[PDB]
Design an enzyme around this catalytic site. Structure first.
Site, short mmCIF file in Angstrom:
data_model
loop_
_atom_site.label_atom_id
_atom_site.label_comp_id
_atom_site.label_asym_id
_atom_site.label_seq_id
_atom_site.Cartn_x
_atom_site.Cartn_y
_atom_site.Cartn_z
CD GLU A 139 48.20 32.99 124.16
OE1 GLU A 139 47.63 32.06 124.77
OE2 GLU A 139 47.58 33.89 123.58
N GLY A 248 34.86 49.99 124.00
CA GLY A 248 34.17 50.77 125.00
C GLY A 248 34.07 52.23 124.62
C1 LIG Z 1 51.95 27.11 125.61
C2 LIG Z 1 50.92 27.30 124.34
O1 LIG Z 1 51.06 28.24 123.60
S1 LIG Z 1 49.81 26.13 124.02
C3 LIG Z 1 49.58 26.03 122.26
C4 LIG Z 1 48.94 24.65 122.01
N1 LIG Z 1 48.64 24.43 120.60
C5 LIG Z 1 47.54 23.79 120.20
O2 LIG Z 1 46.68 23.44 120.98
C6 LIG Z 1 47.37 23.55 118.71
C7 LIG Z 1 47.93 22.21 118.24
N2 LIG Z 1 49.15 21.83 118.94
C8 LIG Z 1 50.36 21.89 118.38
O3 LIG Z 1 50.59 22.51 117.35
C9 LIG Z 1 51.47 21.14 119.07
O4 LIG Z 1 50.93 20.17 119.97
C10 LIG Z 1 52.48 22.04 119.81
C11 LIG Z 1 53.22 22.96 118.84
C12 LIG Z 1 51.77 22.90 120.83
C13 LIG Z 1 53.49 21.14 120.50
O5 LIG Z 1 53.88 20.10 119.61
P1 LIG Z 1 55.10 19.10 119.92
O6 LIG Z 1 55.69 19.39 121.37
O7 LIG Z 1 56.25 19.34 118.85
O8 LIG Z 1 54.50 17.64 119.74
P2 LIG Z 1 53.07 17.13 120.29
O9 LIG Z 1 52.91 17.28 121.86
O10 LIG Z 1 51.86 17.73 119.47
O11 LIG Z 1 53.13 15.57 119.92
C14 LIG Z 1 54.38 14.90 119.88
C15 LIG Z 1 54.18 13.40 119.68
O12 LIG Z 1 53.54 12.81 120.81
C16 LIG Z 1 52.61 11.83 120.31
N3 LIG Z 1 51.64 11.49 121.38
C17 LIG Z 1 50.74 12.24 122.06
N4 LIG Z 1 50.05 11.52 123.02
C18 LIG Z 1 50.59 10.26 122.90
C19 LIG Z 1 50.35 8.98 123.59
N5 LIG Z 1 49.43 8.93 124.57
N6 LIG Z 1 51.10 7.91 123.22
C20 LIG Z 1 52.03 8.00 122.23
N7 LIG Z 1 52.29 9.15 121.55
C21 LIG Z 1 51.58 10.28 121.88
C22 LIG Z 1 52.03 12.54 119.11
O13 LIG Z 1 51.30 11.70 118.24
C23 LIG Z 1 53.31 13.04 118.48
O14 LIG Z 1 53.97 11.93 117.86
P3 LIG Z 1 54.45 11.96 116.33
O15 LIG Z 1 55.22 13.32 116.05
O16 LIG Z 1 55.42 10.72 116.12
O17 LIG Z 1 53.16 11.81 115.38
O1 LIG Z 2 32.41 54.08 120.48
C1 LIG Z 2 33.04 55.15 120.65
O2 LIG Z 2 34.24 55.14 121.00
C2 LIG Z 2 32.38 56.45 120.43
O3 LIG Z 2 31.12 56.52 120.40
O4 LIG Z 2 33.12 57.46 120.27
#
Ligand SMILES: CC(=O)SCCNC(=O)CCNC(=O)[C@H](O)C(C)(C)COP(=O)(O)OP(=O)(O)OC[C@H]1O[C@@H](n2cnc3c(N)ncnc32)[C@H](O)[C@@H]1OP(=O)(O)O
Ligand SMILES: O=C([O-])C(=O)[O-]
Ligand SMILES: CC(=O)SCCNC(=O)CCNC(=O)[C@H](O)C(C)(C)COP(=O)(O)OP(=O)(O)OC[C@H]1O[C@@H](n2cnc3c(N)ncnc32)[C@H](O)[C@@H]1OP(=O)(O)O
Ligand SMILES: O=C([O-])C(=O)[O-]
Lengths: 415, 416
Positions: A139, A248
């Site tokens: 996030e 706004g």
């Molecule tokens: C709370 C928030 O902020 S949500 C943010 C979410 N981010 C995104 O959507 C963007 C892309 N996502 C990512 O960058 C990552 O998924 C993260 C950083 C969010 C989390 O990543 P991690 O927890 O480190 O690992 P992730 O869940 O992606 O996958 C881990 C493993 O599970 C595996 N996996 C997933 N589903 C399956 C399945 N059904 N069967 C077998 N393996 C699986 C993946 O292939 C991976 O394996 P590998 O490393 O050997 O190739």
């Molecule tokens: O868009 C604004 O904030 C304006 O018109 O000052």
């Protein structure tokens, strides 16, 4: 009928960005099959549990109406099942770390041979071109990289993250738009395609008006509506502006009665350009209406915090709800800073289907944010989130697998 | 051949940011978008915060790329008739006028249906129809206040804070867009249009789903185990502000890098990822923390997590944000620089991806806009200039079948 009646979705996603997208797909009528790691499942099932040993709220609020299969796609059987699923699906969604889905052997290029009609949706932290392409993103990482944290907060404080899921749910909403457009496109081409959405881009889209400001700043050297103008200073980058009006009209967060002990005893108050007269009548300052120091936005700006200070002599004497009920008679754009407690109990949000009470097995009642846009020709029916692997056998049977084939998969840890 | 919304006709009554962001995307997807504007005035964003005298402001050009502009006064006898003919030929009508405004023109949803049962009507408002705030005017930050974002953004010892991101405006436009696309898909089955409404409060609330999760946890338990206030501060009855805490992601914070005392953007976001504690410790030269029971789990770190962040900051402040990130990512730490809008505006990879797009506008010349955010393998949006006011009035009227005398009469009668 529902908009996506008959649509089949393969949902590889975990956490929030990908699952917010496929939850909406399910609410629009799609059959959403959530593919989960056997014995483990989506990480949100175990994150910040409030009741021991059952699915966390993070999971139930993001996975309503989905079906759950346990499937290990790194086994020989799992890959075959995955292939059969792709062959029968309209849409595949994944938000794994970069590489992850590729290394399973399920890259875009292989997907097209299996199903040229399939639409593949992919969320990542960063675009293909990015120097940050393999960076894992949560996030607030996207909020930093997308320009939001830079421009949110106060000029004399740090960059600040937004409570709103600019990186997660916002990105899921942006991929959803792409998937819907791709379905409409397929009606013409007879073909699927790949849709990618990065978290950085989702954040940037919502900060379009700060990119407007940056260009203004580059041309002119100042931003006439920002708190820094004209008695403060500008650098080369759009600065933080506190509670200024942003996209706004000029406005601020004002204290109402209770503020010293209640962190939400506040309103947002807008000084709308064409409403200066009403605004003055509201606060008992008839002498300000045509006073040349006050009568235009340009004249008010150098002393605008005195004006907000003056509105605040009124707003702190009444409850935020009383304050708003009065001021809106004068056509002032304003509203209370509603706490999540007030939102969770608000009767009109229940009536509109914005906050929805859903009954979950084992847990009982929980609240979720419902389907946000309203349709005159259909009402989403929001249901429980699936127990882990609850629908494995049914999904395998729909594909044509025998009981022996399924028992072999279980023995072989494919499910 | 071929764009997703090729052949789709859109009547765009919207002004400012929420409705126009929606119809801009529709145009980029291939729809013919006819922006209906008040004669001699146009969308208010044409005149708001001009950086060049006498021409359309950037607020306008960044929201109205690829649209056609007609001047039409729908309060005149002729204007109402043109409006009716436009509704009869259109697939979609979008409006974001103040509550009541479009009703009072004589084509009520109920009237729209009779004119064209195939038409999809999209409507944005500040608040939903059974809200006590149904008639309240809403700008961006008003929606942020009402939707729960301002309440939960900022620091526990400061005020509610608005987000720079357009949670109330462009976010609501994106939510209506989703409804409009779904309604087009639904029409393939029913043969009928429908009304889609989206309020700004709901768009903000949708993005704060995780804070509604936290409210329920707080109601059940009396504490939020991952919030800065736990265990040594106190909780009230509502989810509090948590500063730069991880929110929906993993525990994290905004950390100072080299330059912070004079550069408001010399910072990174740093995530302590649960399954990455070992690498995190190695990155910062604290191998001794890997299995120390005070440090080895998220639960154990939480009561002294700001000491841990303070210890990371002893490294991050000696180096500039970009170098800090290139180093730490070798350890699989989720982190990124706090990119300023200046860095974003000049970033070559954002140009390459079509995320920041240089467009050429008449009179003005070059400007930058945020491009089409999602990427399609079977189609590339072509992002063009925004229309001059009334530039396409004659064309649109002629497409409807009006003669030169009819158009001249309209002009005489201030219908255009
Ligand atoms: C709370 C928030 O902020 S949500 C943010 C979410 N981010 C995104 O959507 C963007 C892309 N996502 C990512 O960058 C990552 O998924 C993260 C950083 C969010 C989390 O990543 P991690 O927890 O480190 O690992 P992730 O869940 O992606 O996958 C881990 C493993 O599970 C595996 N996996 C997933 N589903 C399956 C399945 N059904 N069967 C077998 N393996 C699986 C993946 O292939 C991976 O394996 P590998 O490393 O050997 O190739
Ligand atoms: O868009 C604004 O904030 C304006 O018109 O000052
Ligand atoms: C980028 C953003 O969107 S900012 C966030 C606010 N935007 C929203 O989407 C929320 C919904 N809309 C609103 O609340 C309001 O439009 C506001 C607060 C934004 C602005 O309200 P105002 O500037 O006071 O009035 P608004 O622009 O809506 O309309 C003014 C009048 O123009 C009329 N009008 C608009 N287009 C035309 C036309 N082509 N011909 C004749 N009249 C027209 C309206 O009907 C209205 O008239 P009336 O009061 O005589 O019935
Ligand atoms: O999600 C989180 O923040 C956690 O698990 O601590």
């Amino acid at each position: 009928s529902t908009p996506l009646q008959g649509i089949k979705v393969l949902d590889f996603t975990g956490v929030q960005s990908g699952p917010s997208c496929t939850q909406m797909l399910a609410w629009f009528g799609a059959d959403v099959i959530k593919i989960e790691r056997p014995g483990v499942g989506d990480v949100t099932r175990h994150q910040l549990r409030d009741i021991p040993d059952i699915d966390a709220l993070y999971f139930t609020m993001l996975n309503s109406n989905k079906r759950s299969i346990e499937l290990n796609t790194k086994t020989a059987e799992g890959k075959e099942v995955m292939e059969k699923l792709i062959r029968e699906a309209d849409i595949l969604v994944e938000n794994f770390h970069p590489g992850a889905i590729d290394h399973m052997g399920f890259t875009w290029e292989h997907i097209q041979e299996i199903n040229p009609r399939l639409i593949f949706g992919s969320i990542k932290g960063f675009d293909e071109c990015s120097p940050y392409v393999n960076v894992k993103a949560y996030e607030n990482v996207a909020q930093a990289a997308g320009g939001a944290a830079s421009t949110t907060g106060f000029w004399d404080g740090p960059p600040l993250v937004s409570a709103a899921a600019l990186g997660d749910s916002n990105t899921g909403m942006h991929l959803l738009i792409g998937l819907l457009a791709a379905l409409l496109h397929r009606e013409k081409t007879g073909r699927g395609q790949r849709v990618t959405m990065s978290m950085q881009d989702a954040v940037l889209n919502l900060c379009r008006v700060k990119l407007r400001d940056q260009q203004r700043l580059d041309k002119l050297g100042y931003l006439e509506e920002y708190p820094q103008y004209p008695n403060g200073t500008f650098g080369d980058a759009v600065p933080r502006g506190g509670n200024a009006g942003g996209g706004g009209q000029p406005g601020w967060i004002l204290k109402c009665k209770g503020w010293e002990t209640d962190p939400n005893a506040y309103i947002y108050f807008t000084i709308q350009e064409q409403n200066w007269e009403n605004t003055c009548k509201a606060i008992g300052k008839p002498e300000w209406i045509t006073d040349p120091a006050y009568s235009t936005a340009h004249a008010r700006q150098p002393h605008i915090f005195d004006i907000f200070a003056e509105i605040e002599k009124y707003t702190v004497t009444i409850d935020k709800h009383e304050a708003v009920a009065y001021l809106t008679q004068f056509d002032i754009p304003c509203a209370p800073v509603l706490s999540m407690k007030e939102i969770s109990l608000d009767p009109s949000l229940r009536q509109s289907g914005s906050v929805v009470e859903v009954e979950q097995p084992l847990r009982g009642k929980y609240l979720t944010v419902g389907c946000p846009m309203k349709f005159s020709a259909f009402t989403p029916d929001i249901k429980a989130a699936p127990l882990l692997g609850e629908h494995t056998a049914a999904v395998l049977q729909e594909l044509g697998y025998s009981d022996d084939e399924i028992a072999a998969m279980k023995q072989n840890h494919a499910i």
